[PDB]
Amino acid sequence: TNLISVNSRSYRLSSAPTIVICVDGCEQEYINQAIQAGQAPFLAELTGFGTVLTGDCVVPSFTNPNNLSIVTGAPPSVHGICGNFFFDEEVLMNDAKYLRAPTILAEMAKAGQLVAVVTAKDKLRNLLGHQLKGICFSAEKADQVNLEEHGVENILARVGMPVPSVYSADLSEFVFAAGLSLLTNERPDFMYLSTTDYVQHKHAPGTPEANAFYAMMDSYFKRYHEQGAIVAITADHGMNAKTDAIGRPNILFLQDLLDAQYGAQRTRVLLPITVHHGALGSYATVYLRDAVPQRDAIDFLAGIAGVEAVLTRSQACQRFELPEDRIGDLVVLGERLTVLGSAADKHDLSGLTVPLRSHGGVSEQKVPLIFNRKLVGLDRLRNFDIIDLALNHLA
Amino acid sequence: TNLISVNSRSYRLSSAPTIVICVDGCEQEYINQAIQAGQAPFLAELTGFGTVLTGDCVVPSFTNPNNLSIVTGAPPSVHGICGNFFFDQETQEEVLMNDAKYLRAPTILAEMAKAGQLVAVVTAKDKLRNLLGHQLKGICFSAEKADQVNLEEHGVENILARVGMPVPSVYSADLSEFVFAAGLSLLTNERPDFMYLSTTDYVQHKHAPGTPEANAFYAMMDSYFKRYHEQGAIVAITADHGMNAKTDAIGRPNILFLQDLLDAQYGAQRTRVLLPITDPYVVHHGALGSYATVYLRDAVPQRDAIDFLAGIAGVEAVLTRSQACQRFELPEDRIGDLVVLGERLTVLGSAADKHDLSGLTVPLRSHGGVSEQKVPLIFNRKLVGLDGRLRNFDIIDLALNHLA
Ligand SMILES: [Zn+2]
Ligand SMILES: [Zn+2]
Ligand SMILES: [Zn+2]
Ligand SMILES: [Zn+2]
């Protein structure tokens, strides 16, 4: 068909309705466990006609950076969204204003395709819908969709569900339910769906709660498939326990530690995230005031138990492909079971109602890539290559 | 209060029966999930009176090397057992470390007995019991052969009758349950000063944390932990290594065939791949772990092999003997020219041709690498004098000397 070029990648416009799903916080085990548990029959047999792969997401393994990467088919060094915020002013990249590249989404639309985007959280929806002319809304604000703004109307009635609670599993279901109704009505050419990792943050793979959620998604996949759509599924990042044997969190307050070593006001620990984790992840940035010597800082931090790696700006930028201008002097990586906080005084841990499970580091990098089709031309796979494979590598 | 010193460590003899338990493959998450699920009420309330900590086991995160360090309070560099076997480039043969004849240090257990202490050791597997019973005068037997138990050798008689159970199958949870049960008998009867209990990771290789079956097994242990505690014993719990999934989203295994790989790069026989996770002869899935060692022929340029291997997706790290020894504290004479570590979700095999994966009913769960290094340290008592990097092999020190 018609071929569009976006961010230096060429894409062949879909002939059949294509659905790219981003399963927030999808550590592979979730899937393996549900199947074993017999709670995902569809995925269980998908191997008969499908393709299951494993790819690497973007580091820092956070939702925004990853989602943006998926829809642009590029890394943060291209789209420029490497976290929820940066420094210089503690500015927030919550606006497309911060977007430095186009989405594949907007291009398909410009080429005349009917593109749809559905996300659980409204905030994402903003970033993703940049320059998009089509259907675009969140489950979070389903109640207020209008034709002009969102390309749709009365989705609540259509879906047969009330506005869900942000801190509910219902938020994600809504996403799937909405995607079904659009498929069977409007029949978009391309649809992008994105959930929240609310469940994954609260439950580990293999638990009733987790299995149940997966059982729900599996049903939707089945139905999408039954509709003749092409279904492509991935995740933005993985997920892990960040606790001891009894559920107590393994935290390292970098700000506190740094302040003690070099004296307060001398360093600036930034946590590119913001209840799921109480802003606790395995990745952080550090800004050094002239007073402190990078060499020293590295040695110091690196020797702290729980730190996985200390990278300089250049190191990180090149290794992870990030924008040098929106990253600190140092990049700190947390170990498998460790999260990094700023200062103790600045965190509300009393909100943690269950043992902490988070992401951000390298141990939440492995993510799945699943198709309900067979593929061709397979040569280091990234989660943001999903669209590529879905539009160009079909057998 | 008697003081002894072993392997350069001082230890105060127990005043109360102390029981040190090694829960094989006890990834921390198993405890967390069992508690969250209502299946571990005793452990669930232990914080209020006990102590929960985290340590690093020895890498390779294997069963024998670890258990051995626990009982000697030292690394393999000291006791010598750094795997199931090794390769002697003097004899050009495969050397099986299945005999206490390979031990380079004394066990703390043996010493406590020398000092007049009544010391019991109960393992699930009999093979372990042999290494552990080195120079030990006390009670020592395995559930696996709780059959052939005589007074002269084991220090006990008719344990089956005592426990009220039959001899359990190796490939089962009962195997481990027996251990506990037998430990309860001894405690209530012989009441040893010191006891060491060691299970098998059968269940953990099969079920993930939070699974009905995982939780069940955990609920069983909790029950004994409580009984021991109600008897007044000091209960200290750790693990030999954690456990992880070694598959993809659908449960297919992540396997690297290092022999195959190397052979294709260097040709047949220029390298030798050893998987010390078990005895050299085993070819089943039981032989796949996230650590392997490699012997290079003189012809093969070491740096090159490092680069080659280091470049294969799924290999976390490749280290030379020297680096490996220093870093993990291993005996240089019993490891290969190279040490290969695999990523979190990856295992290392030798040659496809060799392995028999027919036995893998369920998706692969294994260990041996840095991703299975974190382990718990649990005590039913408050502790004091805590000074850097806790090891599982510091358990005895803590349990004997750090009691509050
Ligand atoms: Zn996410
Ligand atoms: Zn999250
Ligand atoms: Zn073990
Ligand atoms: Zn094992």
Swiss-Prot record, chain A:
Gene Ontology BP term (one): phosphonoacetate metabolic process
Xref: SUPFAM superfamilies: Alkaline phosphatase-like
Thermal characteristics: Optimum temperature is 37 degrees Celsius. Activity is rapidly lost after incubation for 30 minutes above 40 degrees Celsius.
Protein name: Phosphonoacetate hydrolase
Induction: By phosphonoacetate.
E.C. number: 3.11.1.2
InterPro entries named among the record's database cross-references: Alkaline_phosphatase_core_sf (IPR017850), Phosphodiest/P_Trfase (IPR002591), Phosphonoacetate_hydro (IPR012710), Phosphonoacetate_hydro_insert (IPR023116)
Protein residues bound to Zn(2+) 1: D24, T63, D236, H237
Cofactor(s) of this protein: Zn(2+)
GO molecular function: metal ion binding; phosphonoacetate hydrolase activity
Entry annotated with the keyword Kinase: no
Gene3D superfamilies assigned to the protein according to its UniProt record, in alphabetical order: Alkaline Phosphatase, subunit A, Domain 2, Phosphonoacetate Hydrolase
EC category: hydrolase
Provenance organism: Pseudomonas fluorescens
Binding-site residues, Zn(2+) 2: D197, H201, H359
